[PDB]
């Protein structure tokens, strides 16, 4: 994977000694080239993960996330061009360095071989985002935002470290290939429950899970837009990639202690989706929407069925493209109106034709029209959960109905209706943010044509 | 907004119709292959076990 | 006014002095060049040729081989009076059962 | 785990006994990374000293990388020596004490009673 | 067709030759006739180009083979070499077994339309043939879990085989 | 078999061509409404021919060509089952839309987005045809939500119309309530029957379809404006008058009823589930007509009558009159 | 342009601070009436009449006729479900 | 035509391509490090023809 | 801004540990999770109790 790693780190010298105006052009073009090179990673064998090196390996689960990160990186590059114009060149290059460093840690995380190496770069993503959230934020609270996001993830991260090093002393290795191949049943000894626990809350705190999610509304609604997408699109999914990994050994414990988190989640998305319907800030809805969508994933991983894992993977990638779009969409409105209140700028279809479309299928992908990959992930979860328990259907079915309730609500309360006559600064929609939405949406329908590439290794 | 839309189709069709022409040309100038019993004395190369020649070419040059 | 600070500058719109710009940056010549190159790279070969690459990828998880090999022993089971597929993946004779 | 092993001459960086081991290759990624540490140190030097960072005095920069690789080289030679010593007392003690590390026979999968937990 | 009836059994097709005693001639007959010689004729010769071009340069593609390796039952614990071979062999057998279920469903589904309203009585043979395959599939690979493996299936096979062994002794009484 | 199935495939793609030309921004937006007329009228014209052999020999088949998902044991492919119901409904649907948007050209002409307007009726038409020309519930689900979001946009044709936005909000909301049963049936079929295509589900002999039948019943209840799921259908009248002579006029409301007759092989099995349909259908006939009896509108009253009618044919489905119900729908 | 005094304060107890929030929230002294102090955190926000936007008179020159609101005037804490599209509290003849 | 600016402007633009080929150089510097069992897995135990002397490189 | 700030910021500074608030916190807190815990546990226990001796309808279910 150094055919991706080496060019990615080579973006640092190139972006750090380019001209004072070419930093945006240079970073965007070669990051896209990295995305094209990363597209070759879509190739997967029947069941053998691509073992490029001793310390790097990939399969049908890592690559779709890998392409998601690499494809994403130019998207914040173009999104940040708007509000980063009024800055010095050296600080601007510092911003680009954080994004590239964030990307580089992401690729190493997904391509990691053993759990400890995965853990190091996994957590290492906290540092670049911590600077992004805090240094370049917009409001006073961002200082409290960073601490909330940092400690929450760390509070669960440290128990996993103790459990991980404990794995090495007991099993003899932490390599994922050996762990799955040398998998042994886990006893129900009272120590083993905490052993199971210490490998879980690390992944579910950043999912986020119901209860342990408050950093999500306190960061995504408050981070800079560029940091907002990568947080929602991929960073939450870091728990997903880990959980499919760590569950290979933590069996058959999952049968019992999934329950306290299952209905914690099962009552979760319905509860969270209710909060989304009754927000006042724009970005607060999508943030609360993200945990709601992430909640069905938690059930998908934990239930441990092949169908749910495919549904987990599809919903994971689909939500990333979606949540990035709505966060980008909110940023476009926030920039002109200098706020994020929902009913502040209702009724803008008459002035924003193309935006009103970009609202339209972005919300529809949030409603998950058929046959968008959102349903393909969502429906697979439903069938797996129903096979587990019939009474499941009412809950998340009601959730995706209250999900439908709000997912038109901002469409009504941002585009439908009459403009505000005192507002007179909604200028012609610039092609930059405009083309940004195009690059968000077309891969969604393109992947809809051939979804078979994003169901993970269980397909 | 119209500047958007013609810029997409122009740039989409810039490499859109050439590869569209190339794929159609390949289908009607080289076609596909046919199943075999693996004639003895020669093991198939890595790109031999594929139907579409473009897929064979992709595996030939990259995989 | 103890904190001597300049007043909040009004946000600039990309189209005031550059109506035909693309909303990328201030200097025009690279603003088109930026637009030309992102509009090139994004929706072109990264998108189009990328789509052909994945669509025309070689055998993905070997399902054509699955069908070809499936038809072979589908015939074999149907030929010599055998069920299409047995109930034991591993032969029950080699497994030494305890007791 | 090694300061009490017999024959350990004190304050002696690389034992003459250690010369029987493969010297670290010059291309060794561990070694070249330590060269980058020298490169990074040079850039930090010009930053505090308010100098043209990358394009500032190369002699100050080139000294940093040249120093780091050298002290990197012997540290890497000492690296494998101790690890080799760990692997030397490894097997000599295993052979000296055979009974506490018995040989395990083969009890292949066809005979184990290991159960299948129904994942439903 | 490339496929044969041993794989995909196609019930024989009969044609109820008409007898239009009515005064008016049938409208379908020449409606299909015109559809034939205004659309099919241009595409038949066009296909002749496509078929003749394929004959001009006909390359070859073969079928990937797989030499059988020792099974997980005969494989060694903590030995990563042999049991990896048995693991991959088991996974391929799973993929083939998945496609066996696919074919029998395809044959079964093809039966239903062929017999039309008589599917209830004329598709029982294909239904039971799929039924025993599905039942064999359920004790074969079902319930293993998302992290299924050769050792996991072997435990299920051993669990089923010891349960029936105990049942057989119980039946002996 | 050389005609018919191929002709149906020709009919359902030529209706997409206006959208393809519309999104290609090469079409002329001025005569596009008239261009839409020619497309729909022609698409109706090629819709008559697939009837001819069905009258002649009554042949029926299923077209499944391009395999989408393998999903281990459950392969997925786009598939249209052309049976008695689907075959003769296409000309009925095609003739209706051609006439109603013929009227709508004169009526719906005092609006800047009449080009975008007529395009929306086209985007309804292929979604509805996707629903009726379906072989697995997922494609019908594709059309189900497609028309529902289509009504959402069409009902809220005036984005400044507050009442239309509420009606559209109620329009999808009740429609999503119906899909809860669709999802319930979706999960049961993939679990107990392990199938999605219509043919396999019927012939697997699911003689215990109790919960699926309730799920099917709930789906039709939301789509066909049953009691408790009725008021969106009157609410849809808030939009432009042609829009009321559209999806919710008699087209989209009967989609759930079309689903009911679709699953008639298993629908008759449970007398209980067989009963609750004609109950709710009967209550709709009384209640909606009762509201229309003392009322002060025109479109609303005939909208209430439609719900009363929409309660009528699936009462007959409740008494096991599937084909007779489908005849009633087209009438 | 923003300060704590015109920011929403804690739950008002003394009558002078009731007047203090009255000028900040832009009503008169008798028109200020905060929510009950049951610990729900509403604090200084006044319990405005339990009405909906549908009850508002269309004929009045609203600064936001799309929802029938006016600039500067105080709004309801629970305005969101009490707007024209959502639940309405207008009287019914029955 | 201003030889200085053309290279000076675009000298940073080759950094990613050289990294790519360098990246493609060393990841396949890895296979010869992981030679071990070549044509030794009995599943792919292929008898070496006289023409070639190696299975893969 | 008064509505948003009071609906977002000034709830905790005005929040009180009042027994009423803890009461509604309790019944809307652990309540519903224990509600659905018992429901799903009872469903799973009632469902599971017939799998181990073959009393369910599973013959045509080989996907999960
Ligand atoms: C880079 C990242 C990781 C950094 C790790 C630490 C690196 C810096 C320290 C290395 C140099 C200092 C230690 C080695 C040295 O100079 O002399 C070793 C030593 C110095 O003598 P010594 O080992 O007796 O001195 C220290 C005593 N103990 C070990 C108890 C702390 O040279 C020898 O000859 C040791 C003989 C015994 C070996 C066993």
PDB file of C-alpha atoms in Angstrom, chain C residues 74 78 84, chain E residues 5-11 100-115 119-134, chain F residues 200 203-205, chain I residues 60:
ATOM      1  CA  UNK C  74     -24.283 -30.233 -10.850  1.00  0.00           C
ATOM      2  CA  UNK C  78     -27.233 -35.597 -11.578  1.00  0.00           C
ATOM      3  CA  UNK C  84     -26.940 -32.206  -5.751  1.00  0.00           C
TER       4      UNK C  84
ATOM      5  CA  UNK E   5     -30.889 -29.572 -19.816  1.00  0.00           C
ATOM      6  CA  UNK E   6     -28.938 -31.624 -17.266  1.00  0.00           C
ATOM      7  CA  UNK E   7     -27.991 -28.336 -15.591  1.00  0.00           C
ATOM      8  CA  UNK E   8     -31.103 -26.317 -16.530  1.00  0.00           C
ATOM      9  CA  UNK E   9     -33.970 -28.658 -17.507  1.00  0.00           C
ATOM     10  CA  UNK E  10     -36.295 -26.845 -19.899  1.00  0.00           C
ATOM     11  CA  UNK E  11     -39.723 -28.517 -20.175  1.00  0.00           C
ATOM     12  CA  UNK E 100     -25.871 -24.955  -6.211  1.00  0.00           C
ATOM     13  CA  UNK E 101     -28.677 -23.375  -4.180  1.00  0.00           C
ATOM     14  CA  UNK E 102     -28.864 -20.666  -6.847  1.00  0.00           C
ATOM     15  CA  UNK E 103     -29.254 -23.126  -9.735  1.00  0.00           C
ATOM     16  CA  UNK E 104     -31.892 -25.241  -8.006  1.00  0.00           C
ATOM     17  CA  UNK E 105     -33.840 -22.074  -7.226  1.00  0.00           C
ATOM     18  CA  UNK E 106     -33.461 -21.047 -10.874  1.00  0.00           C
ATOM     19  CA  UNK E 107     -34.689 -24.462 -12.018  1.00  0.00           C
ATOM     20  CA  UNK E 108     -37.523 -24.339  -9.489  1.00  0.00           C
ATOM     21  CA  UNK E 109     -38.556 -20.811 -10.492  1.00  0.00           C
ATOM     22  CA  UNK E 110     -38.423 -21.738 -14.181  1.00  0.00           C
ATOM     23  CA  UNK E 111     -40.788 -24.621 -13.407  1.00  0.00           C
ATOM     24  CA  UNK E 112     -43.431 -22.348 -11.876  1.00  0.00           C
ATOM     25  CA  UNK E 113     -43.918 -20.217 -14.977  1.00  0.00           C
ATOM     26  CA  UNK E 114     -43.672 -23.224 -17.310  1.00  0.00           C
ATOM     27  CA  UNK E 115     -46.627 -25.000 -15.696  1.00  0.00           C
ATOM     28  CA  UNK E 119     -47.505 -25.060 -10.828  1.00  0.00           C
ATOM     29  CA  UNK E 120     -49.082 -26.521  -7.683  1.00  0.00           C
ATOM     30  CA  UNK E 121     -49.189 -30.062  -9.093  1.00  0.00           C
ATOM     31  CA  UNK E 122     -46.454 -29.913 -11.759  1.00  0.00           C
ATOM     32  CA  UNK E 123     -43.662 -28.281  -9.713  1.00  0.00           C
ATOM     33  CA  UNK E 124     -43.639 -30.584  -6.671  1.00  0.00           C
ATOM     34  CA  UNK E 125     -40.692 -32.578  -8.040  1.00  0.00           C
ATOM     35  CA  UNK E 126     -38.541 -29.465  -8.438  1.00  0.00           C
ATOM     36  CA  UNK E 127     -39.762 -28.092  -5.101  1.00  0.00           C
ATOM     37  CA  UNK E 128     -38.817 -31.178  -3.080  1.00  0.00           C
ATOM     38  CA  UNK E 129     -35.482 -31.403  -4.905  1.00  0.00           C
ATOM     39  CA  UNK E 130     -34.764 -27.843  -3.786  1.00  0.00           C
ATOM     40  CA  UNK E 131     -36.225 -28.630  -0.357  1.00  0.00           C
ATOM     41  CA  UNK E 132     -33.741 -31.407   0.406  1.00  0.00           C
ATOM     42  CA  UNK E 133     -30.889 -29.266  -0.936  1.00  0.00           C
ATOM     43  CA  UNK E 134     -31.938 -26.370   1.304  1.00  0.00           C
TER      44      UNK E 134
ATOM     45  CA  UNK F 200     -40.918 -18.084  -5.962  1.00  0.00           C
ATOM     46  CA  UNK F 203     -45.073 -21.281  -5.332  1.00  0.00           C
ATOM     47  CA  UNK F 204     -43.057 -21.896  -2.170  1.00  0.00           C
ATOM     48  CA  UNK F 205     -46.525 -22.597  -0.695  1.00  0.00           C
TER      49      UNK F 205
ATOM     50  CA  UNK I  60     -36.651 -22.630   3.631  1.00  0.00           C
TER      51      UNK I  60
END
